[model samples]
Target: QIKTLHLDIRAREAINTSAAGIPLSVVVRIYQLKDNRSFDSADYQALFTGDNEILAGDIIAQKDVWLQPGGSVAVDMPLDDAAKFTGVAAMFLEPDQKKNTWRVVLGRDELEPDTPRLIEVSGNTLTLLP
Candidate 1:
């Protein structure tokens, strides 16, 4: 019972080590495309972190409101209660250093659409999809 949900964030493959400069912070993974089919991982719904470069409407995280960080941050989430369910998948919540349980990446968007396609959290293993 969900429809038209919007949220996005991107930043893939960037782990600099020239004396610590690339590992600023980036672990955002939220994917939900219900009616579109292909996203399950229990339909995740929360996980964010941007070191210094996040654009496109920028909102980081909102619902209950919990702010943090001071650089490159962008993550707009406006599910509007997922329209009322019908299709929509892409949730997150597994970045607190890895392993807490909460990762959904159904359907597919990471390049535009639903957003969130960054991968470089140092092998924490977070692959949720239905």
Candidate 2:
């Protein structure tokens, strides 16, 4: 499970406040179902709205990310890789794991969101906000 989390966006860091909702910055955290251990994902991804298929990268999690398990993990293929996508963007995780599961993170001075839910890793073995 999660004890704490940290999300980073490039160098600026991500905030967790929703634009449609009130300004409430939040950190991302995922918890193990039975034992309650946590992990920093292997890779962060998103469904680029253009073609209905997209999963890009960031710190591109190190190799040690998949020593645990979770609720979701999917492979991807882009339908178009179009120029612009506008929809409820998906932010998720993808690491070769022991089980089919992953999640997305955290930071300070938080003023980000609960969607497009930009994420970053501050720790591993546990935890999104979208």
Candidate 3:
């Protein structure tokens, strides 16, 4: 089963969404980028909202990450955990200067490519199987 994760993204230190399955400390970074740069190619230190359990792919706090306004980025989540329960986090220091949060969207074999140009329509956002 797959579910949608909702983030109440605010200026708080610890806030996140629920998990549909084994939650990881993974995240999807969205940036109101102000440069003609690109998403950095590096491994970022990340935190899982489901406690300091062991997980990786903390691409949650992406920066200089080429995200134009109205442009967002999210990677597809693989149903790899047999365990359960998790929530993702978000970020930024100041709108003028900061880099922040990410999420663990659940239940999918493949996620679409997110770029400065995202589609207005939604597709394959939800799925079900047996």
Candidate 4:
């Protein structure tokens, strides 16, 4: 029962933000539920170091995306079988590898294995689609 996550990174017009669209960086951490640990916000925060940035060890994968206004970068992440054994928890960081633009966590039961789950990222905001 593995699931594939579709992440859509897009650049929308931000009224007064920077003119040139800078490439956005994304980093993800994958956790399997077998650990019997609840991964709440604080748990995620606790992974921070180096003036409060997340450790690289926890990151499963990362990508850098460049977009023009109204353009999008799309990616499909297929969960490994090991990660699906007891379900999984995933946290996404719009990583600067420094100051992150936005962060979101998808709980173990949030995704349906049969259908693709969509996650949207704009400037500093992330939206999960229904």
Per-candidate TM-scores read: 0.22, 0.17, 0.25, 0.48
Could you give candidate 4's per-residue lDDT for residues 21-105 as a string of tens digits? 4543433333433222332333435543333223233344444444444455665566544342221222333323244334455
Q: What lDDT does each candidate get?
A: 0.30, 0.24, 0.25, 0.43
Q: By TM-score, who's the top model here?
A: 4
Residue 27 of model 4, lDDT score: 37
RMSD of 1: 13.4
Any idea what lDDT model 4 has?
0.43
lDDT tens digits, residue span 1-130, model 3: 4332222222222212224322122123432212211222221332313332223333232222222222344333332233132222232211111232232232222222231122221111111111
Off by over 4 Å in 1: 1-23, 35-69, 76-130
Which ranking of candidates, highest TM-score first?
4, 3, 1, 2
What is candidate 4's TM-score against the reference? 0.48
lDDT of 2 at 61: 23
TM match of model 1 to true structure: 0.22
Give one digit per residue, the lDDT tens place, for model 1 in 16-98: 11243333333343332223222222223222322322221232223422112222224454544322221222122223234
Report the lDDT of model 4 for residue 82.
Answer: 39
